[PDB]
mmCIF file of all heavy atoms in Angstrom:
data_model
loop_
_atom_site.group_PDB
_atom_site.id
_atom_site.type_symbol
_atom_site.label_atom_id
_atom_site.label_comp_id
_atom_site.label_asym_id
_atom_site.label_seq_id
_atom_site.Cartn_x
_atom_site.Cartn_y
_atom_site.Cartn_z
ATOM 1 N N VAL A 120 45.252 -71.863 116.613
ATOM 2 C CA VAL A 120 46.510 -72.134 115.937
ATOM 3 C C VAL A 120 47.149 -70.864 115.307
ATOM 4 O O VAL A 120 46.491 -70.061 114.629
ATOM 5 C CB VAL A 120 46.279 -73.265 114.872
ATOM 6 C CG1 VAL A 120 47.530 -73.429 114.001
ATOM 7 C CG2 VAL A 120 45.978 -74.577 115.587
ATOM 8 N N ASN A 121 48.467 -70.732 115.459
ATOM 9 C CA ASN A 121 49.205 -69.579 114.850
ATOM 10 C C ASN A 121 50.353 -70.224 114.100
ATOM 11 O O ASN A 121 51.300 -70.679 114.734
ATOM 12 C CB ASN A 121 49.724 -68.647 115.973
ATOM 13 C CG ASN A 121 50.537 -67.424 115.452
ATOM 14 O OD1 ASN A 121 50.425 -67.057 114.302
ATOM 15 N ND2 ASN A 121 51.282 -66.733 116.387
ATOM 16 N N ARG A 122 50.211 -70.277 112.772
ATOM 17 C CA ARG A 122 51.167 -70.856 111.784
ATOM 18 C C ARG A 122 51.921 -69.757 111.090
ATOM 19 O O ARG A 122 51.326 -68.891 110.463
ATOM 20 C CB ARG A 122 50.507 -71.700 110.712
ATOM 21 C CG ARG A 122 49.757 -72.884 111.240
ATOM 22 C CD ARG A 122 49.419 -73.830 110.101
ATOM 23 N NE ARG A 122 48.269 -74.670 110.447
ATOM 24 C CZ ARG A 122 47.956 -75.811 109.839
ATOM 25 N NH1 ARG A 122 48.742 -76.275 108.833
ATOM 26 N NH2 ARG A 122 46.864 -76.487 110.242
ATOM 27 N N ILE A 123 53.228 -69.781 111.266
ATOM 28 C CA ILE A 123 54.054 -68.660 110.848
ATOM 29 C C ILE A 123 55.213 -69.111 109.912
ATOM 30 O O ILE A 123 55.768 -70.182 110.141
ATOM 31 C CB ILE A 123 54.752 -68.018 112.091
ATOM 32 C CG1 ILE A 123 53.722 -67.796 113.278
ATOM 33 C CG2 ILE A 123 55.654 -66.833 111.652
ATOM 34 C CD1 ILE A 123 54.283 -67.710 114.677
ATOM 35 N N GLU A 124 55.568 -68.239 108.982
ATOM 36 C CA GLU A 124 56.804 -68.326 108.177
ATOM 37 C C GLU A 124 57.554 -67.007 108.453
ATOM 38 O O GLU A 124 56.955 -65.935 108.415
ATOM 39 C CB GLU A 124 56.438 -68.377 106.660
ATOM 40 C CG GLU A 124 55.835 -69.609 106.253
ATOM 41 C CD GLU A 124 54.851 -69.447 105.075
ATOM 42 O OE1 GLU A 124 53.683 -68.994 105.303
ATOM 43 O OE2 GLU A 124 55.259 -69.780 103.922
ATOM 44 N N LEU A 125 58.852 -67.147 108.724
ATOM 45 C CA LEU A 125 59.686 -65.986 109.007
ATOM 46 C C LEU A 125 60.861 -66.048 108.098
ATOM 47 O O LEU A 125 61.463 -67.120 107.994
ATOM 48 C CB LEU A 125 60.128 -66.061 110.433
ATOM 49 C CG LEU A 125 61.089 -64.923 110.812
ATOM 50 C CD1 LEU A 125 60.753 -64.562 112.201
ATOM 51 C CD2 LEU A 125 62.631 -65.238 110.600
ATOM 52 N N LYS A 126 61.142 -64.955 107.382
ATOM 53 C CA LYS A 126 62.399 -64.863 106.626
ATOM 54 C C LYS A 126 63.160 -63.618 107.172
ATOM 55 O O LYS A 126 62.558 -62.560 107.290
ATOM 56 C CB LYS A 126 62.075 -64.630 105.119
ATOM 57 C CG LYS A 126 61.851 -65.939 104.245
ATOM 58 C CD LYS A 126 61.124 -67.148 104.900
ATOM 59 C CE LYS A 126 60.948 -68.223 103.819
ATOM 60 N NZ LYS A 126 60.515 -67.496 102.535
ATOM 61 N N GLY A 127 64.437 -63.807 107.532
ATOM 62 C CA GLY A 127 65.332 -62.690 107.909
ATOM 63 C C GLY A 127 66.422 -62.518 106.904
ATOM 64 O O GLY A 127 66.936 -63.526 106.437
ATOM 65 N N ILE A 128 66.708 -61.268 106.537
ATOM 66 C CA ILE A 128 67.788 -61.008 105.544
ATOM 67 C C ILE A 128 68.634 -59.813 106.025
ATOM 68 O O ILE A 128 68.231 -59.069 106.892
ATOM 69 C CB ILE A 128 67.247 -60.750 104.111
ATOM 70 C CG1 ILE A 128 66.426 -59.445 104.086
ATOM 71 C CG2 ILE A 128 66.544 -62.013 103.607
ATOM 72 C CD1 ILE A 128 65.779 -59.124 102.770
ATOM 73 N N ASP A 129 69.807 -59.669 105.414
ATOM 74 C CA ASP A 129 70.730 -58.522 105.766
ATOM 75 C C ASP A 129 71.206 -58.356 107.201
ATOM 76 O O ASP A 129 71.568 -57.235 107.639
ATOM 77 C CB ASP A 129 70.167 -57.216 105.326
ATOM 78 C CG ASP A 129 70.693 -56.868 104.033
ATOM 79 O OD1 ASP A 129 71.879 -56.388 104.050
ATOM 80 O OD2 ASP A 129 69.973 -57.167 103.022
ATOM 81 N N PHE A 130 71.231 -59.470 107.921
ATOM 82 C CA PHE A 130 71.762 -59.447 109.250
ATOM 83 C C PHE A 130 73.305 -59.464 109.248
ATOM 84 O O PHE A 130 73.912 -60.037 108.342
ATOM 85 C CB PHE A 130 71.209 -60.590 110.067
ATOM 86 C CG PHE A 130 69.808 -60.334 110.504
ATOM 87 C CD1 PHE A 130 68.724 -60.845 109.742
ATOM 88 C CD2 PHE A 130 69.570 -59.552 111.625
ATOM 89 C CE1 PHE A 130 67.353 -60.572 110.131
ATOM 90 C CE2 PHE A 130 68.178 -59.226 112.035
ATOM 91 C CZ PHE A 130 67.093 -59.769 111.291
ATOM 92 N N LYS A 131 73.901 -58.859 110.272
ATOM 93 C CA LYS A 131 75.347 -58.935 110.494
ATOM 94 C C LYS A 131 75.612 -60.193 111.312
ATOM 95 O O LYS A 131 75.045 -60.348 112.406
ATOM 96 C CB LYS A 131 75.805 -57.680 111.275
ATOM 97 C CG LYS A 131 75.587 -56.428 110.470
ATOM 98 C CD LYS A 131 75.834 -55.198 111.316
ATOM 99 C CE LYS A 131 75.333 -53.965 110.540
ATOM 100 N NZ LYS A 131 75.739 -52.665 111.202
ATOM 101 N N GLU A 132 76.478 -61.075 110.787
ATOM 102 C CA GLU A 132 76.819 -62.348 111.470
ATOM 103 C C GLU A 132 77.274 -62.161 112.926
ATOM 104 O O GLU A 132 77.041 -63.038 113.758
ATOM 105 C CB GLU A 132 77.928 -63.132 110.736
ATOM 106 C CG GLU A 132 77.665 -63.648 109.320
ATOM 107 C CD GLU A 132 76.243 -64.156 109.042
ATOM 108 O OE1 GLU A 132 75.810 -65.289 109.484
ATOM 109 O OE2 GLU A 132 75.579 -63.382 108.297
ATOM 110 N N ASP A 133 77.916 -61.025 113.196
ATOM 111 C CA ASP A 133 78.445 -60.643 114.482
ATOM 112 C C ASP A 133 77.668 -59.498 115.150
ATOM 113 O O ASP A 133 78.170 -58.826 116.077
ATOM 114 C CB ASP A 133 79.920 -60.188 114.317
ATOM 115 C CG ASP A 133 80.165 -59.237 113.085
ATOM 116 O OD1 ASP A 133 79.233 -58.866 112.275
ATOM 117 O OD2 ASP A 133 81.378 -58.885 112.919
ATOM 118 N N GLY A 134 76.444 -59.250 114.698
ATOM 119 C CA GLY A 134 75.674 -58.223 115.339
ATOM 120 C C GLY A 134 74.944 -58.705 116.580
ATOM 121 O O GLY A 134 75.167 -59.844 117.093
ATOM 122 N N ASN A 135 74.042 -57.842 117.054
ATOM 123 C CA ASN A 135 73.289 -58.141 118.252
ATOM 124 C C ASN A 135 72.387 -59.362 118.125
ATOM 125 O O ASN A 135 72.188 -60.065 119.129
ATOM 126 C CB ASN A 135 72.461 -56.946 118.697
ATOM 127 C CG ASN A 135 73.337 -55.734 118.990
ATOM 128 O OD1 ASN A 135 74.433 -55.887 119.549
ATOM 129 N ND2 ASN A 135 72.876 -54.558 118.631
ATOM 130 N N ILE A 136 71.952 -59.635 116.899
ATOM 131 C CA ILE A 136 70.961 -60.690 116.611
ATOM 132 C C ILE A 136 71.718 -62.021 116.360
ATOM 133 O O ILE A 136 71.619 -62.885 117.204
ATOM 134 C CB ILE A 136 69.977 -60.330 115.515
ATOM 135 C CG1 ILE A 136 69.034 -59.247 116.038
ATOM 136 C CG2 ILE A 136 69.040 -61.578 115.160
ATOM 137 C CD1 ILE A 136 69.476 -57.835 115.674
ATOM 138 N N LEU A 137 72.425 -62.143 115.217
ATOM 139 C CA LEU A 137 73.219 -63.360 114.904
ATOM 140 C C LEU A 137 74.354 -63.587 115.915
ATOM 141 O O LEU A 137 74.817 -64.726 116.075
ATOM 142 C CB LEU A 137 73.684 -63.418 113.441
ATOM 143 C CG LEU A 137 72.550 -63.597 112.384
ATOM 144 C CD1 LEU A 137 73.029 -63.475 110.967
ATOM 145 C CD2 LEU A 137 71.691 -64.880 112.554
ATOM 146 N N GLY A 138 74.789 -62.530 116.631
ATOM 147 C CA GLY A 138 75.888 -62.689 117.631
ATOM 148 C C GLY A 138 75.333 -62.893 119.028
ATOM 149 O O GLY A 138 76.058 -62.777 120.015
ATOM 150 N N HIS A 139 74.004 -63.073 119.136
ATOM 151 C CA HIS A 139 73.335 -63.290 120.443
ATOM 152 C C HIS A 139 73.757 -62.325 121.593
ATOM 153 O O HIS A 139 74.161 -62.784 122.679
ATOM 154 C CB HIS A 139 73.516 -64.749 120.921
ATOM 155 C CG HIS A 139 72.869 -65.771 120.035
ATOM 156 N ND1 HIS A 139 71.632 -66.318 120.318
ATOM 157 C CD2 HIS A 139 73.309 -66.396 118.909
ATOM 158 C CE1 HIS A 139 71.318 -67.205 119.392
ATOM 159 N NE2 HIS A 139 72.323 -67.292 118.531
ATOM 160 N N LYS A 140 73.619 -61.010 121.383
ATOM 161 C CA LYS A 140 74.002 -60.055 122.412
ATOM 162 C C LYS A 140 72.802 -59.438 123.140
ATOM 163 O O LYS A 140 72.958 -58.455 123.846
ATOM 164 C CB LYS A 140 74.838 -58.903 121.854
ATOM 165 C CG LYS A 140 76.086 -59.338 121.077
ATOM 166 C CD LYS A 140 76.627 -58.121 120.314
ATOM 167 C CE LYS A 140 78.095 -58.290 119.921
ATOM 168 N NZ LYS A 140 79.038 -57.473 120.878
ATOM 169 N N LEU A 141 71.611 -60.041 122.989
ATOM 170 C CA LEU A 141 70.426 -59.491 123.610
ATOM 171 C C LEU A 141 70.124 -60.215 124.925
ATOM 172 O O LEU A 141 70.194 -61.447 125.018
ATOM 173 C CB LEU A 141 69.222 -59.575 122.619
ATOM 174 C CG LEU A 141 69.386 -58.887 121.235
ATOM 175 C CD1 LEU A 141 68.042 -59.108 120.457
ATOM 176 C CD2 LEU A 141 69.836 -57.403 121.278
ATOM 177 N N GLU A 142 69.760 -59.432 125.935
ATOM 178 C CA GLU A 142 69.433 -59.960 127.254
ATOM 179 C C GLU A 142 68.111 -60.737 127.186
ATOM 180 O O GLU A 142 67.293 -60.407 126.345
ATOM 181 C CB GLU A 142 69.226 -58.825 128.194
ATOM 182 C CG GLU A 142 70.638 -58.164 128.495
ATOM 183 C CD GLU A 142 70.588 -57.085 129.525
ATOM 184 O OE1 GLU A 142 69.480 -56.626 129.875
ATOM 185 O OE2 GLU A 142 71.702 -56.629 129.941
ATOM 186 N N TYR A 143 67.959 -61.733 128.056
ATOM 187 C CA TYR A 143 66.772 -62.579 128.138
ATOM 188 C C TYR A 143 65.765 -61.936 129.050
ATOM 189 O O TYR A 143 65.577 -62.344 130.211
ATOM 190 C CB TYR A 143 67.166 -64.003 128.614
ATOM 191 C CG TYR A 143 66.054 -65.008 128.418
ATOM 192 C CD1 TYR A 143 65.762 -65.485 127.127
ATOM 193 C CD2 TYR A 143 65.334 -65.478 129.494
ATOM 194 C CE1 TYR A 143 64.725 -66.435 126.903
ATOM 195 C CE2 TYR A 143 64.305 -66.461 129.304
ATOM 196 C CZ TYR A 143 64.026 -66.914 127.975
ATOM 197 O OH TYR A 143 63.070 -67.866 127.703
ATOM 198 N N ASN A 144 65.154 -60.844 128.546
ATOM 199 C CA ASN A 144 64.120 -60.111 129.266
ATOM 200 C C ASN A 144 63.276 -59.351 128.242
ATOM 201 O O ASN A 144 63.471 -59.516 127.040
ATOM 202 C CB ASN A 144 64.702 -59.211 130.376
ATOM 203 C CG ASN A 144 65.799 -58.269 129.860
ATOM 204 O OD1 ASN A 144 65.733 -57.761 128.703
ATOM 205 N ND2 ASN A 144 66.831 -58.005 130.733
ATOM 206 N N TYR A 145 62.323 -58.574 128.739
ATOM 207 C CA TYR A 145 61.357 -57.932 127.835
ATOM 208 C C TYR A 145 60.713 -56.791 128.533
ATOM 209 O O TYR A 145 60.296 -56.920 129.711
ATOM 210 C CB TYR A 145 60.280 -58.959 127.335
ATOM 211 C CG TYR A 145 59.902 -58.702 125.903
ATOM 212 C CD1 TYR A 145 60.567 -59.373 124.861
ATOM 213 C CD2 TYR A 145 58.943 -57.677 125.536
ATOM 214 C CE1 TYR A 145 60.255 -59.097 123.514
ATOM 215 C CE2 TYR A 145 58.649 -57.444 124.217
ATOM 216 C CZ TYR A 145 59.309 -58.139 123.202
ATOM 217 O OH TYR A 145 59.087 -57.860 121.846
ATOM 218 N N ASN A 146 60.633 -55.666 127.805
ATOM 219 C CA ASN A 146 59.945 -54.428 128.288
ATOM 220 C C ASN A 146 58.440 -54.363 127.934
ATOM 221 O O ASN A 146 57.976 -55.057 127.023
ATOM 222 C CB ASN A 146 60.648 -53.201 127.712
ATOM 223 C CG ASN A 146 62.113 -53.142 128.114
ATOM 224 O OD1 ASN A 146 62.401 -52.928 129.251
ATOM 225 N ND2 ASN A 146 63.035 -53.437 127.178
ATOM 226 N N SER A 147 57.666 -53.600 128.692
ATOM 227 C CA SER A 147 56.270 -53.355 128.389
ATOM 228 C C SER A 147 56.131 -52.243 127.382
ATOM 229 O O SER A 147 56.978 -51.358 127.309
ATOM 230 C CB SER A 147 55.499 -52.990 129.649
ATOM 231 O OG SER A 147 55.514 -54.145 130.445
ATOM 232 N N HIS A 148 55.024 -52.284 126.641
ATOM 233 C CA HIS A 148 54.882 -51.543 125.396
ATOM 234 C C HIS A 148 53.347 -51.415 125.060
ATOM 235 O O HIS A 148 52.635 -52.409 125.180
ATOM 236 C CB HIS A 148 55.602 -52.304 124.213
ATOM 237 C CG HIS A 148 57.126 -52.374 124.291
ATOM 238 N ND1 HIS A 148 57.810 -53.559 124.507
ATOM 239 C CD2 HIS A 148 58.088 -51.429 124.105
ATOM 240 C CE1 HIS A 148 59.115 -53.337 124.474
ATOM 241 N NE2 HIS A 148 59.317 -52.047 124.259
ATOM 242 N N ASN A 149 52.861 -50.220 124.683
ATOM 243 C CA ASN A 149 51.603 -50.054 123.911
ATOM 244 C C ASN A 149 51.777 -50.159 122.388
ATOM 245 O O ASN A 149 52.700 -49.547 121.801
ATOM 246 C CB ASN A 149 50.984 -48.665 124.132
ATOM 247 C CG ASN A 149 50.617 -48.391 125.549
ATOM 248 O OD1 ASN A 149 50.571 -47.219 125.946
ATOM 249 N ND2 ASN A 149 50.330 -49.423 126.319
ATOM 250 N N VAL A 150 50.831 -50.883 121.774
ATOM 251 C CA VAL A 150 50.704 -51.242 120.345
ATOM 252 C C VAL A 150 49.500 -50.397 119.861
ATOM 253 O O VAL A 150 48.386 -50.563 120.398
ATOM 254 C CB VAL A 150 50.336 -52.823 120.242
ATOM 255 C CG1 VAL A 150 49.851 -53.240 118.891
ATOM 256 C CG2 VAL A 150 51.544 -53.719 120.739
ATOM 257 N N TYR A 151 49.701 -49.489 118.887
ATOM 258 C CA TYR A 151 48.568 -48.693 118.354
ATOM 259 C C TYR A 151 47.913 -49.327 117.122
ATOM 260 O O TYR A 151 48.585 -49.657 116.127
ATOM 261 C CB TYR A 151 48.930 -47.229 118.113
ATOM 262 C CG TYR A 151 49.564 -46.656 119.361
ATOM 263 C CD1 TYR A 151 50.916 -46.879 119.596
ATOM 264 C CD2 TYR A 151 48.807 -45.980 120.347
ATOM 265 C CE1 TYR A 151 51.538 -46.370 120.735
ATOM 266 C CE2 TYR A 151 49.406 -45.498 121.526
ATOM 267 C CZ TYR A 151 50.801 -45.711 121.696
ATOM 268 O OH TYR A 151 51.531 -45.266 122.792
ATOM 269 N N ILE A 152 46.627 -49.605 117.263
ATOM 270 C CA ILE A 152 45.883 -50.245 116.216
ATOM 271 C C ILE A 152 45.088 -49.161 115.456
ATOM 272 O O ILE A 152 44.468 -48.321 116.084
ATOM 273 C CB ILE A 152 44.925 -51.247 116.832
ATOM 274 C CG1 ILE A 152 45.711 -52.377 117.507
ATOM 275 C CG2 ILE A 152 43.911 -51.784 115.832
ATOM 276 C CD1 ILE A 152 44.926 -52.949 118.549
ATOM 277 N N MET A 153 45.101 -49.193 114.129
ATOM 278 C CA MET A 153 44.112 -48.422 113.420
ATOM 279 C C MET A 153 43.425 -49.203 112.295
ATOM 280 O O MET A 153 43.987 -50.151 111.746
ATOM 281 C CB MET A 153 44.658 -47.048 112.956
ATOM 282 C CG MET A 153 45.930 -46.991 112.131
ATOM 283 S SD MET A 153 46.942 -45.445 112.325
ATOM 284 C CE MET A 153 48.013 -45.897 113.705
ATOM 285 N N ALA A 154 42.208 -48.777 111.918
ATOM 286 C CA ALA A 154 41.630 -49.344 110.681
ATOM 287 C C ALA A 154 42.453 -49.126 109.412
ATOM 288 O O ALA A 154 43.198 -48.111 109.233
ATOM 289 C CB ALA A 154 40.154 -48.968 110.478
ATOM 290 N N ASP A 155 42.319 -50.129 108.562
ATOM 291 C CA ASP A 155 42.809 -50.163 107.196
ATOM 292 C C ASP A 155 41.577 -50.534 106.353
ATOM 293 O O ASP A 155 41.484 -51.652 105.830
ATOM 294 C CB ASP A 155 43.906 -51.215 107.049
ATOM 295 C CG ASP A 155 44.894 -50.919 105.884
ATOM 296 O OD1 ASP A 155 44.517 -50.257 104.890
ATOM 297 O OD2 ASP A 155 46.072 -51.378 105.955
ATOM 298 N N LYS A 156 40.637 -49.580 106.235
ATOM 299 C CA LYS A 156 39.266 -49.827 105.680
ATOM 300 C C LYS A 156 39.273 -50.324 104.219
ATOM 301 O O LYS A 156 38.470 -51.187 103.845
ATOM 302 C CB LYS A 156 38.416 -48.550 105.752
ATOM 303 C CG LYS A 156 37.973 -48.134 107.157
ATOM 304 C CD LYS A 156 38.180 -46.614 107.372
ATOM 305 C CE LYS A 156 37.912 -46.181 108.845
ATOM 306 N NZ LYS A 156 36.489 -45.615 108.995
ATOM 307 N N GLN A 157 40.149 -49.744 103.396
ATOM 308 C CA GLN A 157 40.287 -50.149 101.996
ATOM 309 C C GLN A 157 40.799 -51.611 101.848
ATOM 310 O O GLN A 157 40.623 -52.239 100.791
ATOM 311 C CB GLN A 157 41.166 -49.143 101.204
ATOM 312 C CG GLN A 157 41.463 -47.743 101.913
ATOM 313 C CD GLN A 157 42.919 -47.211 101.657
ATOM 314 O OE1 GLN A 157 43.168 -45.998 101.709
ATOM 315 N NE2 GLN A 157 43.867 -48.125 101.380
ATOM 316 N N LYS A 158 41.378 -52.173 102.914
ATOM 317 C CA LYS A 158 41.785 -53.600 102.926
ATOM 318 C C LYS A 158 40.949 -54.439 103.872
ATOM 319 O O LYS A 158 41.295 -55.600 104.187
ATOM 320 C CB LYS A 158 43.268 -53.784 103.239
ATOM 321 C CG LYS A 158 44.144 -53.068 102.237
ATOM 322 C CD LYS A 158 45.588 -53.511 102.336
ATOM 323 C CE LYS A 158 46.367 -53.128 101.085
ATOM 324 N NZ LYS A 158 47.682 -52.533 101.504
ATOM 325 N N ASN A 159 39.842 -53.848 104.328
ATOM 326 C CA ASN A 159 38.935 -54.550 105.249
ATOM 327 C C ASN A 159 39.646 -55.124 106.506
ATOM 328 O O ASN A 159 39.242 -56.171 107.053
ATOM 329 C CB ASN A 159 38.199 -55.657 104.464
ATOM 330 C CG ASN A 159 37.016 -56.261 105.244
ATOM 331 O OD1 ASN A 159 36.321 -55.554 105.985
ATOM 332 N ND2 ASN A 159 36.818 -57.559 105.089
ATOM 333 N N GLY A 160 40.703 -54.445 106.972
ATOM 334 C CA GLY A 160 41.431 -54.978 108.115
ATOM 335 C C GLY A 160 42.013 -53.890 108.979
ATOM 336 O O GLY A 160 41.448 -52.823 109.118
ATOM 337 N N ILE A 161 43.160 -54.167 109.577
ATOM 338 C CA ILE A 161 43.821 -53.192 110.448
ATOM 339 C C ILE A 161 45.337 -53.050 110.131
ATOM 340 O O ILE A 161 45.925 -53.953 109.531
ATOM 341 C CB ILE A 161 43.636 -53.567 111.915
ATOM 342 C CG1 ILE A 161 44.330 -54.889 112.183
ATOM 343 C CG2 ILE A 161 42.168 -53.494 112.290
ATOM 344 C CD1 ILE A 161 44.644 -55.190 113.618
ATOM 345 N N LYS A 162 45.907 -51.921 110.544
ATOM 346 C CA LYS A 162 47.348 -51.586 110.463
ATOM 347 C C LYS A 162 47.797 -51.384 111.916
ATOM 348 O O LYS A 162 47.112 -50.735 112.748
ATOM 349 C CB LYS A 162 47.605 -50.253 109.724
ATOM 350 C CG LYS A 162 47.485 -50.212 108.229
ATOM 351 C CD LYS A 162 47.925 -48.795 107.753
ATOM 352 C CE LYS A 162 47.232 -47.665 108.507
ATOM 353 N NZ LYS A 162 46.934 -46.592 107.467
ATOM 354 N N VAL A 163 48.966 -51.895 112.270
ATOM 355 C CA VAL A 163 49.473 -51.757 113.661
ATOM 356 C C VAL A 163 50.916 -51.358 113.478
ATOM 357 O O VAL A 163 51.585 -51.896 112.582
ATOM 358 C CB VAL A 163 49.335 -53.123 114.435
ATOM 359 C CG1 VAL A 163 49.780 -52.973 115.879
ATOM 360 C CG2 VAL A 163 47.902 -53.720 114.340
#
Side-chain angles (χ1 to χ4, degrees):
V120 172
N121 179 20
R122 300 193 203 199
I123 313 157
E124 289 150 282
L125 176 144
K126 272 37 176 318
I128 65 183
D129 265 281
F130 284 95
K131 296 171 191 189
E132 297 323 285
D133 44 0
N135 300 321
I136 290 95
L137 293 173
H139 296 262
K140 306 167 160 258
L141 303 181
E142 288 185 347
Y143 193 74
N144 53 36
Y145 217 93
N146 301 291
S147 294
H148 292 112
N149 299 154
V150 166
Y151 309 82
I152 295 154
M153 54 209 89
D155 206 333
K156 289 135 187 262
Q157 346 142 154
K158 301 194 163 135
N159 192 35
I161 64 161
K162 285 185 310 219
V163 183

